[PDB]
Design an enzyme around this catalytic site. Sequence first.
Site, PDB file in Angstrom:
ATOM      1  N   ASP A   1     -21.559  -0.080 -18.555  1.00  0.00           N
ATOM      2  CA  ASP A   1     -20.363   0.548 -18.036  1.00  0.00           C
ATOM      3  C   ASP A   1     -20.288   1.972 -18.556  1.00  0.00           C
ATOM      4  O   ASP A   1     -20.706   2.285 -19.662  1.00  0.00           O
ATOM      5  CB  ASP A   1     -19.113  -0.193 -18.470  1.00  0.00           C
TER       6      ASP A   1
ATOM      7  N   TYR B   1     -23.953  -6.492 -29.107  1.00  0.00           N
ATOM      8  CA  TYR B   1     -22.969  -5.424 -28.965  1.00  0.00           C
ATOM      9  C   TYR B   1     -21.993  -5.390 -30.147  1.00  0.00           C
ATOM     10  O   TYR B   1     -21.756  -6.403 -30.811  1.00  0.00           O
ATOM     11  CB  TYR B   1     -22.111  -5.618 -27.706  1.00  0.00           C
TER      12      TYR B   1
ATOM     13  N   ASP C   1     -11.004  -2.373 -19.391  1.00  0.00           N
ATOM     14  CA  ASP C   1     -11.347  -1.369 -20.406  1.00  0.00           C
ATOM     15  C   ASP C   1     -10.267  -0.288 -20.389  1.00  0.00           C
ATOM     16  O   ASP C   1      -9.283  -0.436 -19.678  1.00  0.00           O
ATOM     17  CB  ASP C   1     -12.716  -0.731 -20.121  1.00  0.00           C
TER      18      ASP C   1
ATOM     19  N   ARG D   1     -16.365  -7.350 -21.390  1.00  0.00           N
ATOM     20  CA  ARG D   1     -15.031  -7.014 -20.919  1.00  0.00           C
ATOM     21  C   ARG D   1     -14.315  -8.319 -20.692  1.00  0.00           C
ATOM     22  O   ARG D   1     -13.168  -8.465 -21.104  1.00  0.00           O
ATOM     23  CB  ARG D   1     -15.076  -6.215 -19.621  1.00  0.00           C
TER      24      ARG D   1
END
EC number: 5.4.99.25
Length: 300
Positions: free
Chosen positions: A39, A67, A81, A172
Amino acid sequence: MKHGILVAYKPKGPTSHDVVDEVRKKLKTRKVGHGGTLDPFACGVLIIGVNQGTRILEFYKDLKKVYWVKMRLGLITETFDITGEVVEERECNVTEEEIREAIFSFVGEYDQVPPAYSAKKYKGERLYKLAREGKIINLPPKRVKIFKIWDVNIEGRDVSFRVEVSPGTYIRSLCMDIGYKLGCGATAVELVRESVGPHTIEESLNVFEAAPEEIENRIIPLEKCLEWLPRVVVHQESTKMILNGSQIHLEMLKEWDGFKKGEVVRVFNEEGRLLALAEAERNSSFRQERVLTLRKVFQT
RNA sequence: GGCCACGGUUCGAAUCCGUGGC
């Protein structure tokens, strides 16, 4: 003209393709792609294929990723987000115990619905395209697995932690789900992919700040790529055969290195060259039955 | 390869890949 994979760094801001273009601008080519999108608001490892390398990109989509994420409790958006234009603030009054509890309550497997703002497809169109046109799509869930969570750090309403998840998992959605479990809602604000398979962010390069030379040298040759995956070697003679269609047979192999069935295999000749990637047709035991079926051939 | 349709991948890939057709 190098052919291979390049472990790049995608700064916070530009899109994954903006990365490719940057690369293909430096190397003056068009044969450039990535093996997994990031993203725009996120940043980190982005596998970038150059020339014949684009052909192996599909194999990185199945690697585990690592991550470091920082979500904000009490925040909710339509994009999951901080780039969402339709925000909803909510009152957050949960104890750090209730937070960590929710966080680790996700370690394992669960059915994750893809965010309407994804590159998935419905009827020829991309979800993110449809979402902008006002139509939200609800695709069937995907059994995703979260391997582990660590370095959890809680500061008021900004929770942060590291996580290792199976391929195809949306951080997300992970956050949104944790925010739901907590009732206050959550939204990913910072996302940093530290690794894809064995490719760390340390081994990464910010293609946007490097010069052609620098980028060229950091390209890994098809041989050195896909380090995982079984590798077999074939007598230098059979090479010409393989480079011209032709499946692989027992009398062509020189070394085995056990493997599965439909498992991808790397095919090296004797002079030490990647000839092709092929799917096994058997197992790995002791007649010219095709033991391996080509899956891709390289005319480097 | 190119030209169409359909998918994939953590969202602004027509641009990368993969499947069908020519």
